[PDB]
Design a protein around this motif. Structure first.
Motif, PDB file in Angstrom:
ATOM      1  N   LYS A 160       0.834  -1.186   0.000  1.00  0.00           N
ATOM      2  CA  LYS A 160       0.000   0.000   0.000  1.00  0.00           C
ATOM      3  C   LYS A 160       0.882   1.255   0.000  1.00  0.00           C
ATOM      4  O   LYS A 160       1.966   1.265   0.573  1.00  0.00           O
ATOM      5  N   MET A 161       0.483   2.261  -0.763  1.00  0.00           N
ATOM      6  CA  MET A 161       1.232   3.502  -0.805  1.00  0.00           C
ATOM      7  C   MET A 161       0.393   4.678  -0.343  1.00  0.00           C
ATOM      8  O   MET A 161      -0.557   5.041  -1.018  1.00  0.00           O
ATOM      9  N   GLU A 162       0.840   5.373   0.697  1.00  0.00           N
ATOM     10  CA  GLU A 162       0.297   6.691   1.016  1.00  0.00           C
ATOM     11  C   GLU A 162      -0.035   7.480  -0.245  1.00  0.00           C
ATOM     12  O   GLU A 162       0.632   7.341  -1.258  1.00  0.00           O
ATOM     13  N   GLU A 163      -1.114   8.252  -0.208  1.00  0.00           N
ATOM     14  CA  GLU A 163      -1.798   8.603  -1.445  1.00  0.00           C
ATOM     15  C   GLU A 163      -0.817   9.222  -2.438  1.00  0.00           C
ATOM     16  O   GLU A 163      -0.444   8.597  -3.428  1.00  0.00           O
ATOM     17  N   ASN A 164      -0.348  10.428  -2.147  1.00  0.00           N
ATOM     18  CA  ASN A 164       0.308  11.222  -3.182  1.00  0.00           C
ATOM     19  C   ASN A 164       1.820  11.357  -3.021  1.00  0.00           C
ATOM     20  O   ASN A 164       2.544  11.409  -4.009  1.00  0.00           O
ATOM     21  N   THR A 165       2.291  11.264  -1.782  1.00  0.00           N
ATOM     22  CA  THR A 165       3.610  10.716  -1.482  1.00  0.00           C
ATOM     23  C   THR A 165       4.055   9.590  -2.414  1.00  0.00           C
ATOM     24  O   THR A 165       4.933   9.785  -3.241  1.00  0.00           O
ATOM     25  N   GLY A 166       3.581   8.377  -2.153  1.00  0.00           N
ATOM     26  CA  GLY A 166       4.212   7.178  -2.681  1.00  0.00           C
ATOM     27  C   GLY A 166       5.035   6.497  -1.607  1.00  0.00           C
ATOM     28  O   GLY A 166       5.458   5.353  -1.766  1.00  0.00           O
ATOM     29  N   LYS A 167       5.247   7.187  -0.492  1.00  0.00           N
ATOM     30  CA  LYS A 167       5.622   6.515   0.744  1.00  0.00           C
ATOM     31  C   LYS A 167       4.950   5.139   0.787  1.00  0.00           C
ATOM     32  O   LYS A 167       4.124   4.844  -0.056  1.00  0.00           O
ATOM     33  N   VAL A 168       5.304   4.284   1.738  1.00  0.00           N
ATOM     34  CA  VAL A 168       4.679   2.957   1.810  1.00  0.00           C
ATOM     35  C   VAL A 168       4.174   2.581   3.210  1.00  0.00           C
ATOM     36  O   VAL A 168       4.928   2.055   4.030  1.00  0.00           O
ATOM     37  N   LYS A 169       2.870   2.736   3.436  1.00  0.00           N
ATOM     38  CA  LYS A 169       2.258   2.328   4.703  1.00  0.00           C
ATOM     39  C   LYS A 169       1.855   0.853   4.742  1.00  0.00           C
ATOM     40  O   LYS A 169       1.822   0.173   3.719  1.00  0.00           O
ATOM     41  N   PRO A 170       1.520   0.363   5.937  1.00  0.00           N
ATOM     42  CA  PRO A 170       0.930  -0.962   6.097  1.00  0.00           C
ATOM     43  C   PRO A 170      -0.582  -0.953   5.893  1.00  0.00           C
ATOM     44  O   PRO A 170      -1.250   0.013   6.223  1.00  0.00           O
ATOM     45  N   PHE A 171      -1.121  -2.055   5.414  1.00  0.00           N
ATOM     46  CA  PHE A 171      -2.552  -2.160   5.254  1.00  0.00           C
ATOM     47  C   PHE A 171      -3.230  -2.077   6.616  1.00  0.00           C
ATOM     48  O   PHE A 171      -2.899  -2.846   7.523  1.00  0.00           O
ATOM     49  N   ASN A 172      -4.227  -1.198   6.725  1.00  0.00           N
ATOM     50  CA  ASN A 172      -5.046  -1.073   7.928  1.00  0.00           C
ATOM     51  C   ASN A 172      -6.404  -1.742   7.740  1.00  0.00           C
ATOM     52  O   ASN A 172      -6.561  -2.580   6.859  1.00  0.00           O
ATOM     53  N   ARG A 173      -7.336  -1.498   8.658  1.00  0.00           N
ATOM     54  CA  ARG A 173      -8.498  -2.390   8.796  1.00  0.00           C
ATOM     55  C   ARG A 173      -9.433  -2.275   7.607  1.00  0.00           C
ATOM     56  O   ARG A 173      -9.854  -3.289   7.055  1.00  0.00           O
ATOM     57  N   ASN A 174      -9.776  -1.039   7.244  1.00  0.00           N
ATOM     58  CA  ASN A 174     -10.276  -0.732   5.916  1.00  0.00           C
ATOM     59  C   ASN A 174      -9.848  -1.739   4.846  1.00  0.00           C
ATOM     60  O   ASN A 174     -10.689  -2.308   4.149  1.00  0.00           O
ATOM     61  N   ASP A 175      -8.552  -1.786   4.574  1.00  0.00           N
ATOM     62  CA  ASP A 175      -8.044  -2.504   3.420  1.00  0.00           C
ATOM     63  C   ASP A 175      -8.272  -3.987   3.615  1.00  0.00           C
ATOM     64  O   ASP A 175      -8.534  -4.718   2.666  1.00  0.00           O
ATOM     65  N   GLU A 176      -8.083  -4.433   4.850  1.00  0.00           N
ATOM     66  CA  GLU A 176      -8.411  -5.793   5.260  1.00  0.00           C
ATOM     67  C   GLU A 176      -9.889  -6.101   5.008  1.00  0.00           C
ATOM     68  O   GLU A 176     -10.268  -7.215   4.645  1.00  0.00           O
ATOM     69  N   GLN A 177     -10.708  -5.077   5.172  1.00  0.00           N
ATOM     70  CA  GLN A 177     -12.135  -5.233   5.367  1.00  0.00           C
ATOM     71  C   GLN A 177     -12.810  -5.226   3.995  1.00  0.00           C
ATOM     72  O   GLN A 177     -13.714  -6.014   3.738  1.00  0.00           O
ATOM     73  N   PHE A 178     -12.375  -4.311   3.128  1.00  0.00           N
ATOM     74  CA  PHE A 178     -12.763  -4.315   1.725  1.00  0.00           C
ATOM     75  C   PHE A 178     -12.366  -5.599   1.007  1.00  0.00           C
ATOM     76  O   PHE A 178     -13.194  -6.246   0.364  1.00  0.00           O
ATOM     77  N   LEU A 179     -11.083  -5.943   1.077  1.00  0.00           N
ATOM     78  CA  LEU A 179     -10.588  -7.171   0.461  1.00  0.00           C
ATOM     79  C   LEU A 179     -11.443  -8.366   0.832  1.00  0.00           C
ATOM     80  O   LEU A 179     -11.816  -9.152  -0.022  1.00  0.00           O
TER      81      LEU A 179
END
Lengths: 378, 369
Positions: free
Chosen positions: A332-351
């Motif tokens: 997962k990449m922070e939106e407009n940065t491109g930095k790289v965050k970890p998947f949070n519950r949202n992303d777990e939850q949609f998937l």
């Protein structure tokens, strides 16, 4: 895409009873005060409502610069205040809300702390405060004297907002009254309520939108269940897109050899899309539950541009037992940065919700390819 | 779980775009002067319409002093026909319901002006049937409108028969105290409704989401799948008969064939479909025996099952006799009923479409065997 969905929301999907898995859930101030509460009370729109409050505090009590702050909360329950509604320098602006947005984390700052304790603060000299940050004051040669910084809470006393007044207007070089608190803090107590209704309404609007997305993706993948390669592309494309990740990689448990993987489909996130590190796939098949790793160069489970954060789910079939494939998101990449965050519950939850249809579709695509292999035996 | 708990006004269930493609992305979206406040404070916390009503009910008690009190909630169905409902009504279980301009109340509803009534037995609008049956004498009457902020009437509340020494009318100054508190209820009431409509718009998405997991489970037979489809549609929509027609695969103004289920279960295997097949659009016949047909089948919803690119008509769906629950009584279809089917048809589309392709290989293999 997934990142305006990133406050705390209900599950998209719900179990019951060895959970079979489902979607479907279940005097003349007193006088004035009123006229104000009416004026906000009709706003369910936070932006709108925030403006109206900011406007109100102004003639609410007398000082030089006002500030409103709105608490927030990502989906991981990490909180923070932001404000775009900030009194500045006085005849002097690009624009107002100046494209431009203060953000304090939780418990930092004078306001940070008001927040995190939810008691008001009546400072007489900002500079006496160990949490005053004078950097702004210095650079712009404003002299921050006195500070009124009160929490705004919803009925349950939850803090939703902070609002403060700087440098009481005065021709006796003055401070903020005991009275002055009261008036300000009364009017806020209403806000905290109205505002909170505003947040809960905008959560549902979102909770909706998310499901509309899910439905659209539902239709998408379902259009053409006749070629494995075809359908995986749309799953892959569609996800990388919505999830803002860097790779997606689908593994198909082989239909005969119920162990290992017959096909595999990869996709980098500058779009190319063709047909070698099976460890997580095999875990998540044999474990049968999702895998979330904030970063693998720190996970004691798996012998250690390149592969930082991993959220890797499994596709089950209909009747809900055989894992028929696996889905490996990476980075997962922070939106407009491109930095790289970890998947949070949202992303777990949609998937989780998404691969239910991923399942159905892949399963029925396979059926088709099946029958097709019959026909080519004579 | 019934189409009918969603029968108010909702966002368009689907947007269609410049050229075919229906999307689900819809709505373009991301003194008592002081004593009053105590009161406003207390309601504003509430977004549950029930719980907010029960609260308004109490407040109005302590607000003007009168024998019997009642509060009325406006309502609205897909079709935009307002009624009033009420379950908070001093008779000093059951739920009143008045149509739109009936009654005193229904009148102050529809005009959204207050009636301050000195003797009741004089107002035309009054009727004494009930005083009489029960031995109450209605006498004086304050009936006030409750408006949200755009001045629309969202509810009505009224107080009957002042408490007095001298025998009391309702004071030039009771009206005010009341209208007052009522202004706030208008606004809060409105938001709470707004909230719940949202809540409802989302339960809708999950019905579909559900009853699509349902469909696309196995797509390996046109016979299986239409059973699954029809069965659910019948219970969900609350009709007596679903009939699914599938256009001839081969060419084209025919009808390959036809599932048809009625509402207890399984035995299966004729104009109306036709017209939709050709028009390409939904058909809504309130009374089936008063149109362009010559004639039970009192009431007709037919929707066209389109296809992939949404430009051909794969198939057709029709249902008969919408029958309100608490009754059985038959009854026409409305915007709700169209809308849900408008959506449920899409997936049905792909559902079917995709099974067709499968049989198109079962049937390639019945040229050998």
């Amino acid at each position: 895409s997934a990142s305006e969905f990133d406050r705390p929301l209900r599950p998209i999907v719900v179990k019951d009873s060895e959970g079979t898995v489902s979607f479907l859930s279940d005097g003349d101030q007193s006088s004035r005060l009123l006229e104000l509460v009416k004026d906000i009370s009709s706003h369910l729109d936070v932006t709108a409502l925030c403006h109206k409050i900011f406007l109100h505090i102004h003639g609410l009590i007398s000082a030089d610069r006002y500030s409103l702050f709105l608490v927030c909360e990502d989906s991981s329950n990490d909180k923070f205040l932001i404000s775009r509604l900030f009194d500045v320098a006085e005849g002097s602006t690009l624009e107002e809300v100046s494209n431009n947005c203060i953000r304090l984390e939780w418990n930092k700052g004078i306001v940070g702390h008001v927040a995190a304790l939810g008691e008001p603060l009546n400072i007489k000299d900002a500079y006496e405060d160990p949490r005053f940050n004078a950097e702004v004051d210095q650079i712009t040669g404003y002299k921050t004297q006195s500070i009124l910084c009160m929490p705004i809470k919803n009925h349950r006393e939850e803090v939703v907002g902070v609002a403060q007044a700087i440098n009481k207007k005065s021709g006796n070089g003055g401070t903020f009254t005991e009275k002055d608190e009261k008036d300000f803090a009364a009017y806020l107590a209403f806000c905290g309520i109205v505002l909170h209704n505003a947040q809960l309404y905008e959560t549902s609007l979102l909770e909706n939108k998310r499901n509309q997305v899910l439905l659209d993706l539902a239709s998408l993948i379902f259009e053409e269940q006749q070629s494995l390669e075809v359908i995986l592309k749309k799953i892959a494309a569609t996800i990388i897109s919505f999830m803002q990740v860097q790779k997606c990689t689908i593994f198909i448990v082989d239909e005969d050899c119920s162990d290992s993987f017959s096909s595999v489909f990869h996709m980098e996130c500058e779009e190319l899309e063709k047909s070698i590190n099976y460890m997580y796939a095999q875990y998540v098949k044999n474990t049968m539950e999702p895998l979330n790793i904030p970063d693998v160069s720190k996970d004691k489970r798996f012998p250690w541009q390149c592969i930082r954060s991993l959220l890797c789910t499994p596709i089950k079939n209909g009747k809900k037992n055989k894992v028929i494939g696996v889905c490996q998101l990476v980075n997962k990449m922070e939106e407009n940065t491109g930095k790289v965050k970890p998947f949070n519950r949202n992303d777990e939850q949609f998937l989780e919700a998404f691969v239910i249809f991923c399942g159905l579709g892949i399963q029925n695509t396979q059926m088709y390819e099946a029958v097709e292999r019959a026909m080519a035996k004579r």
